[PDB]
């Protein structure tokens, strides 16, 4: 399966991505790194791997879904099967989400539903709980909406602070979203009719 990573900063999780294709036997490239913003860290990742990468300024047209229809445009292109957000800043429009439905995946610091929008690190510290995680799930028109595909848990310690929180629950995050891509460009893991993950067993052995 061909992948675009679609960022608008430090694209984090992306060298993890691209980290876990080149094993041996990976079911996923990652063809293309799109970000929104000029000269932002996650494309020197990019390019630095040898992979192409564009960059799609919202401000040069009239709305969010010619926009989106201009990164749809790229996807084109390239023969994207599989679309990974990694710090995408833009929330896109319906049509966008609809086309990409099932295969379109997004990661969160929290074990979700707990600890929606920003700061789901400060959220688990300011409310006290003792596991906290990450969660990998399709990307839905709703933020933090869509249905789950991978999670793990992570300890908070006594001492913590956001910092070494962050930092922990970024080790399962670099563990977690190149296994769920794997599931999902391997097609193990694919989005039923019935808008629900399903657990494929492949004809090819
Ligand atoms: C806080 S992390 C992220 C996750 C969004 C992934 C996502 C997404 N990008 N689009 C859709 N439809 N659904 C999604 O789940 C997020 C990103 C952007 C916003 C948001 O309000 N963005 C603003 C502007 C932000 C900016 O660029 O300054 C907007 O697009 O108008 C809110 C949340």
Same mark, same amino acid.
């Given at each position: 399966?061909?992948?675009?990573?679609?960022?608008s900063?430090?694209?984090?999780?992306? &060298?993890?991505?691209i980290?876990s294709?080149?094993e041996?036997?990976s079911?996923? &490239?990652i063809?293309?790194?799109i970000?929104?913003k000029?000269?932002v860290? =996650?494309?020197?990742k990019? /390019?630095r791997?040898?992979?192409?990468?564009?960059?799609?300024?919202?401000?040069?047209?009239?709305?969010?879904?010619?926009?989106?229809?201009?990164?749809?445009?790229?996807?084109?292109?390239?023969?994207?099967?599989?679309?990974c957000?990694?710090?995408?800043?833009?929330?896109?429009? *319906?049509?966008?989400? &609809?086309?990409?439905?099932?295969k379109?995946?997004?990661?969160?610091?929290?074990?979700?539903?707990?600890?929606? *929008?920003?700061?789901?690190?400060?959220?688990?510290?300011?409310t *006290?709980?003792?596991?906290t995680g990450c969660?990998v799930?399709?990307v839905a028109?709703?933020?933090?909406?869509? &249905?789950?595909?991978l999670?793990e848990?992570?300890?908070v310690?006594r001492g913590d602070?956001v910092?070494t929180?962050?930092?922990?629950?970024k080790?399962?995050?670099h563990?977690?979203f190149?296994?769920?891509?794997?599931?999902?460009?391997? =097609?193990?893991?694919?989005? =039923?009719?019935?808008g629900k993950?399903?657990?494929?067993? /492949?004809?090819?052995?």
């Amino acid at each position: 399966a061909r992948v675009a990573v679609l960022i608008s900063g430090t694209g984090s999780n992306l &060298q993890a991505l691209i980290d876990s294709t080149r094993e041996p036997n990976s079911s996923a &490239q990652i063809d293309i790194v799109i970000s929104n913003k000029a000269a932002v860290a =996650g494309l020197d990742k990019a /390019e630095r791997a040898g992979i192409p990468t564009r960059v799609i300024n919202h401000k040069l047209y009239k709305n969010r879904v010619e926009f989106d229809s201009a990164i749809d445009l790229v996807l084109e292109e390239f023969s994207i099967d599989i679309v990974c957000l990694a710090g995408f800043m833009r929330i896109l429009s *319906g049509p966008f989400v &609809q086309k990409w439905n099932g295969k379109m995946l997004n990661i969160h610091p929290s074990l979700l539903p707990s600890f929606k *929008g920003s700061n789901a690190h400060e959220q688990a510290l300011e409310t *006290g709980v003792t596991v906290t995680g990450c969660t990998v799930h399709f990307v839905a028109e709703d933020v933090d909406a869509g &249905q789950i595909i991978l999670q793990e848990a992570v300890p908070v310690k006594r001492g913590d602070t956001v910092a070494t929180l962050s930092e922990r629950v970024k080790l399962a995050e670099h563990k977690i979203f190149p296994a769920a891509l794997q599931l999902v460009a391997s =097609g193990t893991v694919q989005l =039923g009719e019935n808008g629900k993950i399903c657990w494929v067993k /492949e004809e090819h052995h």
